[PDB]
Amino acid sequence: KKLTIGLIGNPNSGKTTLFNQLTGSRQRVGNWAERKEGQFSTTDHQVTLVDLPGTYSLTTQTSLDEQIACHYILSGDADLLINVVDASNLERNLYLTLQLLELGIPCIVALNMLDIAEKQNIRIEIDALSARLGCPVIPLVATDTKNVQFVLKLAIDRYKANENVELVHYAQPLLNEADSLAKVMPSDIPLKQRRWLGLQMLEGDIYSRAYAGEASQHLDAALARLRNEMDDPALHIADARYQCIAAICDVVSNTL
Ligand SMILES: Nc1nc2c(ncn2[C@@H]2O[C@H](COP(=O)(O)OP(N)(=O)O)[C@@H](O)[C@H]2O)c(=O)[nH]1
């Protein structure tokens, strides 16, 4: 029955509400090595709900909360990740959701605060979002107990690996140098995550270097060949990311 789930999401997106709604008062606040942990029953599982520190990005010195959240997702202790998303500010919240899907980690998106999005004249299309993200999207109003118990626990029991859908289309030189960096990293890290990490290093992420072994030292040489192939490598990563995120927001969002 054991199943470890990690709630992940932006700050002020109804994360603690959803955590509390599922856990109730079956919680244990301790400390990493604040670590918040909870328990709740499903049909097929008894879940260990690991609350993670709220963050906008798995990349960036910043606070200690940001790092532990990032490291936990890479650690791979969790079977499933439930990503609490604010529906009223989708674009802003999707950047973390993209990173989780780029890491290839099985996850369910808890699309929350839909009533606020509805009040702001925004009707998000659930099936369209699920199709383009490649993971179950559960519409929610976390504050309503009637709504939270509707399907979420049902979705948790039938979870699978994400659909291998196309997300960000980076230029080939970026994928080349990210792959070269990925070959230097320890092989126990999945190849799909090693390439993503390599790309974060090129953009100038401070965290990703930790999982790279000695690949972090080969950065400037890769950046040199990138800087002669394009004006700036870090920007081109950020450009391609935007069109992906923005293209999802367009086809998924509508007038109520
Ligand atoms: N209207 C609405 N409000 C919500 C919903 N979920 C959470 N909230 C409200 O948003 C605020 C922040 O919620 P919280 O869970 O603390 O977010 P956090 N800090 O990311 O854990 C709270 O005042 C809460 O009542 C929702 O689905 N709909």
From Swiss-Prot:
Location of region: NFeoB, GTPase protein domain, binds GTP but not ATP: 1-256
Superkingdom of source: Bacteria
Protein name: Fe(2+) transporter FeoB
Protein induction: Iron uptake is repressed by the global regulator Fur in presence of Fe(2+). Induced by hydroxyurea.
Gene ablation phenotype (knockout): Poor uptake of Fe(2+).
Localization terms from the record: Cell inner membrane
Entry binding sites for GTP 1: 9-16
Subunit: The isolated N-terminal domain (residues 1-274) forms trimers.
UniProt effect for mutating residue 115 to N: Loss of guanine nucleotide-binding specificity and Fe(2+) uptake
Domain notes: Contains a guanine-nucleotide-specific nucleotide-binding site (about residues 1-276) that shows slow GTP hydrolysis. When a non-hydrolyzable GTP analog binds to the trimeric N-terminal domain, it induces a structural shift which opens a pore.
Organism of provenance: Escherichia coli (strain K12)
Record family assignment: Belongs to the TRAFAC class TrmE-Era-EngA-EngB-Septin-like GTPase superfamily. FeoB GTPase (TC 9.A.8) family.
Binding residues annotated for GTP 3, in chain numbering: 51-54
Role noted for this protein: Transporter of a GTP-driven Fe(2+) uptake system, probably couples GTP-binding to channel opening and Fe(2+) uptake. A guanine nucleotide-binding protein (G proteins) in which the guanine nucleotide binding site alternates between an active, GTP-bound state and an inactive, GDP-bound state. This protein has fast intrinsic GDP release, mediated by the G5 loop (about residues 149-158). Presumably GTP hydrolysis leads to conformational changes and channel closing.
Covered residues, full protein: 2 to 263 of 773
